[PDB]
Amino acid sequence: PRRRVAAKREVLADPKYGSQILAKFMNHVMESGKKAVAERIVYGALDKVKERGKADPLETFEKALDAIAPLVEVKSRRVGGATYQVPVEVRPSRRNALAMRWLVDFARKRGEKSMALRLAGELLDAAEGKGAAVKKREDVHRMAEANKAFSH
Amino acid sequence: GQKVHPNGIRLGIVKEHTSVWYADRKNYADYLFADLKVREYLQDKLKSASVSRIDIHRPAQTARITIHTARPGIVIGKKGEDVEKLRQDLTKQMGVPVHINIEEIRKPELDAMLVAQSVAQQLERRVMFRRAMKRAVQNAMRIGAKGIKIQVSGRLGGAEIARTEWYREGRVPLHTLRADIDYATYEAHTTYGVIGVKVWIFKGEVIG
Amino acid sequence: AKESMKNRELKRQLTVAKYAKKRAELKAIIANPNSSAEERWNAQVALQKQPRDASASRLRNRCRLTGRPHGFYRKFGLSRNKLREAAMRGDVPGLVKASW
RNA sequence: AAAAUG
RNA sequence: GCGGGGUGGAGCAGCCUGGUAGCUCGUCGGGCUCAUAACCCGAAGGUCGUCGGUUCAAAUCCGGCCCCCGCAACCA
RNA sequence: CGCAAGGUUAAAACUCAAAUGAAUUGACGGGGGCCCGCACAAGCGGUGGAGCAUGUGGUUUAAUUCGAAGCAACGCGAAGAACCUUACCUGGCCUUGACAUGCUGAGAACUUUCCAGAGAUGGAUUGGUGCCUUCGGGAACUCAGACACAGGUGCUGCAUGGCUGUCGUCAGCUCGUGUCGUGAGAUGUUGGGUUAAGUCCCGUAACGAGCGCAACCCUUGUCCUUAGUUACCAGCACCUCGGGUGGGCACUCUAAGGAGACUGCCGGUGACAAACCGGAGGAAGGUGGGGAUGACGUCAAGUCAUCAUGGCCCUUACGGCCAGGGCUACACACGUGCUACAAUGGUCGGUACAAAGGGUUGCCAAGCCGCGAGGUGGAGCUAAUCCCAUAAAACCGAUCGUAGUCCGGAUCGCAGUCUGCAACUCGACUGCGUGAAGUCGGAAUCGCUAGUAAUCGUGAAUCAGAAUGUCACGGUGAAUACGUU
Ligand SMILES: [Mg+2]
Ligand SMILES: [Mg+2]
Ligand SMILES: [Mg+2]
Ligand SMILES: [Mg+2]
Ligand SMILES: [Mg+2]
Ligand SMILES: [Mg+2]
Ligand SMILES: [Mg+2]
Ligand SMILES: [Mg+2]
Ligand SMILES: [Mg+2]
Ligand SMILES: [Mg+2]
Ligand SMILES: [Mg+2]
Ligand SMILES: [Mg+2]
Ligand SMILES: [Mg+2]
Ligand SMILES: [Mg+2]
Ligand SMILES: [Mg+2]
Ligand SMILES: [Mg+2]
Ligand SMILES: [Mg+2]
Ligand SMILES: [Mg+2]
Ligand SMILES: [Mg+2]
Ligand SMILES: [Mg+2]
Ligand SMILES: [Mg+2]
Ligand SMILES: [Mg+2]
Ligand SMILES: [Mg+2]
Ligand SMILES: [Mg+2]
Ligand SMILES: [Mg+2]
Ligand SMILES: [Mg+2]
Ligand SMILES: [Mg+2]
Ligand SMILES: [Mg+2]
Ligand SMILES: [Mg+2]
């Protein structure tokens, strides 16, 4: 807007795990106002992660998130005569939402049985970085690096 | 832009309904139709008499009509056989027994309907509008009347291009609701068509 | 909303109101299951020979002031727009503009 | 960045 | 007689390396605009001059027929 | 005169009623400076691709009745076209007429249950002549005859009133006196701040005022009192374990009257002003949320078809009555929606919680009969009591395993149900079966800042029947805003 008066309502409604990042992932994965469906999907994926990896799924989710969080991104700018793209570093808050959005978007289109094992596969892949989300993050990064002549 | 009806938006707050009674689905339409017909008939017959407000009160199986006018002798003439013939006329519009009360109003030149009708009837006699409107505003302002606005629209004079004129005096706050703006409209059927008259009168601020 | 339209719909009103029971009798005969075709066919013929302009489906209620067919509120007897005039003038009892 | 006419 | 060439309504890729018909202008329809022009986006439109032959298979290669050119050479 | 280019001196016919200078108000600029708005940006979800509904353009027709046309027309007048509506076409039938007033004459309307015709209409048609009389006659009714007429959804919204859209819910628009200018005009209304605001402060040839902003109004969120029926049930009891009963005024709830929030207090800043940034208390804090309220005027904006109205127009018809047909046609194009293209789902079984409203020419329960749409039946309710009427999405368990499919439902065939005199043109639902396009959609384009977007259901109006439209009510419930190029 033009005022900068908009507030920031805080939502932290983790039922049993008591995690903040999990709550925002819930809000991201929720569709058409179906909270219960999101709860069941995310918890099934989490339980699959647990039954697969001996490590506790909390830290696996955290390290998958921290391996998909970008640092800089390319943004278009209207110079008045040319189509230019400038690299800008991410705001510390925005990278979490970017990672969540990328993860859910890439998980939505696997083609396997259900989003339980879809999100399970994505979390395992991004835990060390063999998922498509990490590849596209690296592609965005290499855009930003190849457009470093502007930088500023 | 279009202005809301000043009397409509003040109904319930400071204005009062002219037809006050109670009914149900069986005879709500019947009672309402009877009231409109009786008001139309009264105005059409005693248009010569300066009648302003007609109130209808309907207790059980009866109707009590109170008429506001500035010339009571016209209806109360030589002990008011006019009243009885009027009752006989009214008895058929609504089958219930009728009851007529004639109410006198002080200061007829502070009443919106009377002022509008006077202006219209002056216009019908080919009196140019500016003098009539100025004298109406003068008379109203000379006694109380903390505000008055008069508007006349149509084919003023005889020119074949309609236009609008209006004069105001005092203050006439329409957006406020504590005020009691008396408002009236009337028409004049001259040889060139219809000329419309609107009058707003602001009397005071209703406190309490 | 011609004069003729109002007169000729008053005609429908009058004809429908004037019989007002024979239709009920014949429909009771027809609707009753145990009536026999002998007592059903004569009722059919009675319904057929009776004038067509005496039915509820043949009536279109209009404004009692002008006769506008569309925009009718059967709570009142008024059309779409004379309701507004009457309400603003204050003739309609108990009616105010609502916000809630 | 482009942009002639009524 | 010499050389080149025949491919949507018009003009050119696809030919060399046989297996994979595209492009520009037109027609139609829709976009952008207060409206037109200019622009932008879709759809239709050629199974590849013709026939045989080679090949498992020919718009891609070998002959005949028909036509078009650059030619010389025709000048009523 | 000049080498040439050309320079210098210098007319006329003809043609127009102007050409021109300086300044003023507005508008505009691919001039500039500040500021605002889902205007961008940051996000979510769509339209444009499919089928269907609905309106419009075009074409066709005897007619597809008129009006609305950039935003500000196109689920619009129409909150209900099978007959009517209805205004159009075909055909048939009326001329003081379907209606009102003036004149004359004869008589009750009613009910006569009949015939000719698609029908208006016509003809027989049991029965009573009626009410009050200065008892002479009159009223009102039915019909007949003559004119003055009655009639028109006929034309003109560029002759009008009234009503409405739009800029725009943007903060602007003016006047009195004074002053400056020969004047049109200008000051007030400019400046520095601040605000959502011409809101406020101080300055200041201006001093004041009005219409606007804000406030007064409705609703919601906290609490107190009043009051407990058809409403409620903490405590006692009865108990056939149902507020079912005695009973209670506890609570909720219903609806009237009232308190509360006013920058009130604290810290910081600020011209120690207005005001700004945090904090306590507080249910709510900075016009708490939403609605009604639309200034001077603009578009010769819309409407003569709601109504009224100055003209002009027809009188055997451009006025009336009736039966059928059309407005629902169809090589195409456009706007607005619904259902989908599935596994954050399709079915199967049992299971949980809302708000709002309508009902005596009405709602219409129980039992019973039918696969069903539905049928008999009649209780109760003039409604906090009875009915409409069981909310759905949600949760759990079984199944389907991504296949044009246990997806999707158009189209189509056969037989039904309901209202209506009558469902062929041309209604809605029901049973069986067939089962299409559709793999998330180019250019382009739309809505939305918090109980919001998205998604699921419920009610009302119009109405014999006919909602994917309109208006209204709740359940679940997001992401995003660095900022103004
Ligand atoms: Mg009329
Ligand atoms: Mg009807
Ligand atoms: Mg030109
Ligand atoms: Mg011009
Ligand atoms: Mg000049
Ligand atoms: Mg400008
Ligand atoms: Mg955007
Ligand atoms: Mg479409
Ligand atoms: Mg299309
Ligand atoms: Mg049309
Ligand atoms: Mg709409
Ligand atoms: Mg007809
Ligand atoms: Mg106009
Ligand atoms: Mg007008
Ligand atoms: Mg002077
Ligand atoms: Mg000046
Ligand atoms: Mg000025
Ligand atoms: Mg100026
Ligand atoms: Mg001045
Ligand atoms: Mg002045
Ligand atoms: Mg100003
Ligand atoms: Mg000025
Ligand atoms: Mg002010
Ligand atoms: Mg206000
Ligand atoms: Mg308004
Ligand atoms: Mg116009
Ligand atoms: Mg027009
Ligand atoms: Mg139509
Ligand atoms: Mg907003």
The C-alpha torsion from B4 through B7 and B13 to B19, rounded to 10°, is -130
* One-letter amino acid for residue C79 of the chain: S
Count the Cβ atoms, other than its own, within 10 Å of residue B59: 11
DSSP string of B186-200, one letter each residue:
EEEEETTEEEEEEEE
DSSP state of B66: E
Backbone conformation region of residue B142, classed left if phi is above 0, alpha if psi is from -120 to 50, else beta? alpha
A72 forms beta bridges with A89
Phi, psi of B89 (to 5 degrees): -65, -45
- Nucleotide with C1' nearest the C4 CA: F98
Distance A115 CA to F298 C1' (A): 60
CA A25 to chain CA centroid, nearest Å:
8
Strand D contact residues in chain A (41-100), C-beta within 7 Å: 80-81
Assess contact for B156 and B163: CB atoms under 8 A. Answer: yes
Half-sphere exposure for C7 (CA within 13 Å, toward CB): 3
Name the residue among C77, C93, C97 with its Cβ closest to that of B9: C97
Q: How far apart are CA B6 and CA C88, in angstroms?
A: 8
Pair of tokens at residue C75: 């709570």
Q: How far apart are CA B178 and CA B207, in angstroms?
A: 7
CA B175 to chain CA centroid, nearest Å:
22
Q: For residue A37, give every residue at least 6 positions away whose Cβ sits within 8 Å of its Cβ, in sequence order, or none.
A: A30, A31
* One-letter amino acid for residue A32 of the chain: S
Asked whether the beta carbons of residue C90 and residue B18 sit closer than 8 angstroms, the reply is yes
Backbone conformation region of residue A19, classed left if phi is above 0, alpha if psi is from -120 to 50, else beta? beta
Q: For residue A133, give every residue at least 6 positions away whose Cβ sits within 8 Å of its Cβ, in sequence order, or none.
A: A68, A102, A103, A106, A122, A125, A126
Helix axes A94-107, A115-128, angle to 10 degrees: 130
Q: For residue A150, give every residue at least 6 positions away whose Cβ sits within 8 Å of its Cβ, in sequence order, or none.
A: A84, A85, A86, A87
- Closest by CA to A113, choosing from A33, A45, A37, A32, is A45
Resolution, Å (one decimal): 2.6
Q: How far apart are CA A61 and CA A14, in angstroms?
A: 15
Q: Where are the alpha helices (DSSP H) in A67-152?
A: 94-107, 115-128, 132-146
Pair of tokens at residue C53: 């302009």
Q: How far apart are CA B1 and CA B16, in angstroms?
A: 27
Pair of tokens at residue B144: 């109380």
Q: How far apart are CA C34 and CA C22, in angstroms?
A: 20
The C-alpha torsion from C82 through C84 and C88 to C94, rounded to 10°, is 100
Q: What angle do CA B74, B76, B78 make, to 5 degrees?
A: 100
| Touching partners of B (3+ C-beta pairs < 8 Å) | C
DSSP state of C72: B
- Closest by CA to B89, choosing from B80, B102, B77, B98, is B98
Q: What angle do CA B101, B62, B71 make, to 5 degrees?
A: 15
B69 forms beta bridges with B51, B104
Q: What angle do CA C84, B7, B166 make, to 5 degrees?
A: 105
- Closest by CA to B53, choosing from B91, B92, B19, B6, is B19
Q: How far apart are CA B37 and CA C2, in angstroms?
A: 20
* One-letter amino acid for residue A4 of the chain: R
Assess contact for B180 and B206: CB atoms under 8 A. Answer: yes
Q: How far apart are CA A119 and CA A107, in angstroms?
A: 6
CA B120 to chain CA centroid, nearest Å:
13
Q: How far apart are CA B122 and CA B177, in angstroms?
A: 33
In the block, which residue shows the tokens 């109707």?
A: B63
- Closest by CA to B29, choosing from C9, C97, C74, is C74
Method: cryo-EM
In the block, which residue shows the tokens 């105001």?
A: B168
Burial (0-12, 13-18, 19+ Cβ within 10 Å), B71: middle
Pair of tokens at residue C10: 């008053």
Q: How far apart are CA B51 and CA B75, in angstroms?
A: 10
Name the residue among B9, B17, B39 with its Cβ closest to that of C93: B17
Buried b (16+ CB within 10 A) or exposed e, C23-35: eeebeebeeeeee
Which chain C residues are Cβ-neighbours of B180 within 8 angstroms?
Answer: none
Pair of tokens at residue B26: 């069986």
